[PDB]
Design a protein around this ligand. Structure first.
Ligand SMILES: NC(=O)c1ccc[n+]([C@@H]2O[C@H](COP(=O)([O-])OP(=O)(O)OC[C@H]3O[C@@H](n4cnc5c(N)ncnc54)[C@H](O)[C@@H]3O)[C@@H](O)[C@H]2O)c1
Ligand SMILES: NC(=O)c1ccc[n+]([C@@H]2O[C@H](COP(=O)([O-])OP(=O)(O)OC[C@H]3O[C@@H](n4cnc5c(N)ncnc54)[C@H](O)[C@@H]3O)[C@@H](O)[C@H]2O)c1
Ligand SMILES: NC(=O)c1ccc[n+]([C@@H]2O[C@H](COP(=O)([O-])OP(=O)(O)OC[C@H]3O[C@@H](n4cnc5c(N)ncnc54)[C@H](O)[C@@H]3O)[C@@H](O)[C@H]2O)c1
Ligand SMILES: NC(=O)c1ccc[n+]([C@@H]2O[C@H](COP(=O)([O-])OP(=O)(O)OC[C@H]3O[C@@H](n4cnc5c(N)ncnc54)[C@H](O)[C@@H]3O)[C@@H](O)[C@H]2O)c1
Lengths: 334, 336, 334, 333
């Protein structure tokens, strides 16, 4: 049984917990956040986006009790003061958003944790980044003790890029994500030290945003390094995002051939990772989807035999959370 | 001085905003409004605007007219444009903004009713109606022959000036556009039927909704040099007004974002003044509510992959900018 | 087995269909709407609010196939031309919004239907109105061939009123409902001859609206006839509403005592109709709730021993759709 | 000229600044917030709700330059270390939300300010609360050095209560406010130790909230103390709220008479505070209104001659900000 601790019981932390408490192979031993177990228990059972927790939730002054299983609840701002050694934590899910650099994420290993999974792109280039179904086989159990699971957008874009790249090559690519609002944005216009637009009211605006997903894809798919960039527009929805990839391929092809390969990948080497649809879907048709990427056949367009606009959905919350579990399960086995 | 007589068929978002923008012009004379509701509901919707605020002036009504700033305007309720009294009113231009008469057969009812010229506030349903975008191809207008015209779409009016600047300076090999578009009256609040686009029937408050757009092809019409070289799509999002275009374009000559921004800023200060705007500020959509521009180039949001591959971003108030272009086109046609 | 046809496959019609199609005692034989089976099947499969249909959906040019069941699909503007006599319809669910008067509803009877259930308050004083768990025992099989299941708000308010009246009496009561947006509202400012406010954009505004639910409960609970009125505020939410009842009681009492009686009723009589909670719930905690009314203890306030403000939630879509089934089932058995 | 500093350049602080920088009798000398002048210049210039600043906005490392006027920008978390004596600050607008107690607000006076106006209800009983046009005349310049301007909801409800009470008395009143989302709420579900609902996603939910605004009216209008209580529902709108008041009056009356008195007040002794409308209004019809309260005659309902439901709108951002300025101008005269 693999022992897991969660640092940051937020949107991602609670969703990895919800997805993982079902697995007998996993054991969640601790949750760390800046609030009491009462509020953690409330946020676990009630979810404005993914519905009520399908199970029993209780709490003590010192723990949550989920389906009878006891999980320790601690509240320490500094990860170094966490009891990871006493709980002998194998994996710590770093999902606070505040320790995406190595010096901060190294604090969990100092506390006694064996492996640290950062649920976000790393700020340092020396932390390996993995996307399940793209480059997770490059993981080194003997050396990679702090890893990154990339971004929700990277996890959506990289599988699409991989199928296109494998079959027709990519000369150039520009991506746009139309992304759901997240917790980093305020409800009304407010301060924002390093991105002024990011402080504008998320309920009111379409908001241009930077994304690192494109080059992060360059990390996971080196063959596309230097050939893709991207940006983002935050829109006033609470969850589910979509990627629009304009691609110039090397070989001539058509949308029918691309769709054939996407469908094949979704049924084969990327089943459970890449999804495929021909239906007239809109974003809420993917609420609580566990897939990283859902290729939208009807929304795609072809300018000509080498220029395409490919569209893929993702639940930026639920899909990433399940990938976080998938990566841990992989690391534990291999 | 001399006055152009205008009637509005369809007193909706575009119709009321065309009225708001044009009633300030002393050379224009709005002589009639046609819609399916009595002047009482029309006065109410004219007075109060959830997006552009209260009407800055006095609005009253009778059973047969609105009274705006002392001026009386005839208010009729006739579904059939053919039964409208355009001949009696000596209507020079009819703004067809109901959304139901974008083909020649439907718009021709206004000419049969007596109007001299008809401006469709939308893309024509068929290529047999000429389309004009101010500052791009409105000089190709023929006063003696083009009696039914189209002012294209908001997206076309935003995309085309960008395309024009890029093409004239570096050429275009390919261009793929996406518009992130505000919600409009064609979408319901909750999931409902929609025969012509199933996605079009899903709830607008809840979803990102992929949609089809003809704006790319329409620009190919207004700019023949670019025909076949541009396509596009749309995503409707839960905002009530203001949209943004994201154009992925491959140029012929090598260039850079600095050079492109230089030409965009030059165009906005020169030949496309009042049509194309230019900004370097960290703007978001609500910063353009009630903007009169067709297209506002957003230098900070643009990205360059390489010397020939760029992602250009341009905003537009799909209600207010288009309504101001409808008036400009009518003014242009009047002068010649 | 009871044979049911649905006129108007909209929000209410589709949800009634979702809740009932698993029922072996019910047989849905026909669906009538203004579109062909492909759009109806699409709308049955994907719901922006209640998620994907948990089952299989197929279609023909003339029929739907749900979980193997074949349902005829028609498109007739005039109910009088519907094949109810030929299909032997026991109950017709009138959920178009256009035939809530007796002359309009009677067209289903002339076409061959035996019973018509209007999914809204009737425009006619001689059409009986029932709220399950409040006054449905007054249904007379021999005379009530066209009945009304009231409004979603009436089904929420009446259970609250029933308990308070039965235990402490009601001298006066004023109701306010904060109501989710519905299909009658536009996305942007537009015309609306019978209620100008109703035409204003639902995404942007709090919109005052009139409601008849207050007098309608006077119909179902005659003891309160003439003693309560109400109003409504439409807000930019796609589903779930809340009732805020300001009530002057006859006998002295306390919030503790009221909550205790609400809790008893939720666990015994009115079980499945009235729900009870002491948690810090918000509207999305009730998406796809099947209850008519959920009493919110913590949201309630007491001015004094005879003046209370009681709060109760309801999924105006799902709860009402389930009560339409319950009403049909009650009528069917006797 | 009155020398004013703003502590907390947020929604209220910036909107107070916009309305007041136009006033030649006022002199804004300093702004304190936790961000650099660039971000403050940005937020002053562009407003998602009230549009672009109608004027010129410039900034340096150490100041804002608004319409030619130079204003100091400081970034100090502890108000005791603020440069109020050097700047000779007459009034400090406390709009951070973190110093609504006397121990906290008094730090501005310890720092050199003469008066402190809190843009929110005070925590302490000994800090007087004023509503313009209701009880502001009770201000005592010799002793009231820290005052509260109450809440946006109290400023909307109290004028309504005053006219009803003066004409027909109040036996009971229960108020509900349908309130716009504010900076206190997250976009998505998150923690909130003292009120769990307050942490739920504001874009997707109707959110019940506690309010003291009814009880505050009991303080500003002592005759109604113990007779009025209330609650709140936060809804997914960015601005403008509405109060809904269920009132049992003492004297028999009618909606027609109440409306007449409301219209009389809006035109007379509460012009600029109380507004009156008979139109079919909705929330966005009041964006950027400077009124505290707008009586909505058509939305009102009468159960009988003594039981009414009265409805009044308010721009919780813009109306309150103007009340803060009005209070400062009153205290300075
Ligand atoms: N939201 C998404 O869709 C998404 C997708 C992929 C990855 N991510 C990444 O996951 C990370 C978390 O995102 P989220 O949306 O769950 O955010 P969130 O704000 O919902 O959760 C973060 C949580 O961390 C807790 N926390 C903060 N500081 C802490 C500390 N010092 N110690 C312990 N707990 C602390 C907070 O109370 C909060 O609940 C971010 O870095 C984000 O970029 C988010
Ligand atoms: N909304 C935008 O941003 C935008 C911008 C550019 C172009 N347009 C075009 O303008 C047209 C109208 O757009 P809108 O947003 O104003 O729509 P809208 O829903 O506001 O409708 C326009 C008006 O037409 C009236 N109408 C309907 N049938 C009529 C009839 N038979 N006779 C007279 N009036 C009738 C309606 O009552 C309505 O008020 C569409 O063709 C649209 O494509 C819209
Ligand atoms: N949505 C709610 O919260 C709610 C709650 C309780 C009851 N209701 C009542 O139920 C009724 C339906 O409301 P809704 O929200 O489902 O509306 P809706 O607009 O979602 O669905 C109504 C359907 O009627 C169909 N229709 C229209 N004309 C028709 C005709 N002539 N013949 C056949 N079908 C026709 C339409 O295509 C449409 O799908 C209303 O009367 C409403 O007041 C609504
Ligand atoms: N927004 C409304 O509708 C409204 C109406 C009436 C009253 N109020 C009250 O006014 C106050 C401000 O609310 P708001 O909506 O403007 O909030 P906001 O979050 O928009 O602004 C608060 C500001 O305080 C500043 N701040 C935080 N800590 C600080 C510190 N230590 N020193 C200096 N500045 C600091 C922050 O950067 C932030 O800009 C609150 O007390 C609120 O309850 C708000």
């Amino acid at each position: 049984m693999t022992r897991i601790a969660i640092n940051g019981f937020g949107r991602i932390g609670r969703l990895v917990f919800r997805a993982g408490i079902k697995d007998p192979n996993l054991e969640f031993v601790a949750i760390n956040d800046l609030v009491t177990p009462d509020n953690l228990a409330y946020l676990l059972k009630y979810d404005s986006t993914h519905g009520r927790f399908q199970g029993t939730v209780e709490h003590t002054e010192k723990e949550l009790i989920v389906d009878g299983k006891k999980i320790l609840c601690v509240s320490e701002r500094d990860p170094e003061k966490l009891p990871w050694k006493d709980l002998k934590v194998d994996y710590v899910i770093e999902s606070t958003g505040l320790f995406t650099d190595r010096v901060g994420a190294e604090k969990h290993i100092k506390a006694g944790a064996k492996k640290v999974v950062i649920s976000a792109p790393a700020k340092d280039k020396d932390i390996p980044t993995f996307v399940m179904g793209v480059n997770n086989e490059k993981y080194n159990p003997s050396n990679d003790h702090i890893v990154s699971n990339a971004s929700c957008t990277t996890n959506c874009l990289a599988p699409i890029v991989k199928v296109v790249l494998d079959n027709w090559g990519i000369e150039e690519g520009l991506m746009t994500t139309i992304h759901a609002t997240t917790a980093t944005q305020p409800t009304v216009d407010g301060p924002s030290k390093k991105d002024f637009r990011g402080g504008r009211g998320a309920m009111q605006n379409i908001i241009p945003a930077s994304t690192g997903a494109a080059k992060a894809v360059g990390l996971c798919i080196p063959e596309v390094n230097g050939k893709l960039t991207g940006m983002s527009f935050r829109v006033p929805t609470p969850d589910v995002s979509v990627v629009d990839l304009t691609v110039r391929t090397t070989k001539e092809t058509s949308l029918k051939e691309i769709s054939a390969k996407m469908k094949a990948a979704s049924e084969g080497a990327m089943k459970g990772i890449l999804g495929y649809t021909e239906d007239m879907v809109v974003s809420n048709d993917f609420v609580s989807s566990t897939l990283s990427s859902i290729f939208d056949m009807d929304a795609c367009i072809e300018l000509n035999s080498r220029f395409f606009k490919l569209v893929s959905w993702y639940d930026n919350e639920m899909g990433y959370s399940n990938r976080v579990l998938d990566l841990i399960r992989y690391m534990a086995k291999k």
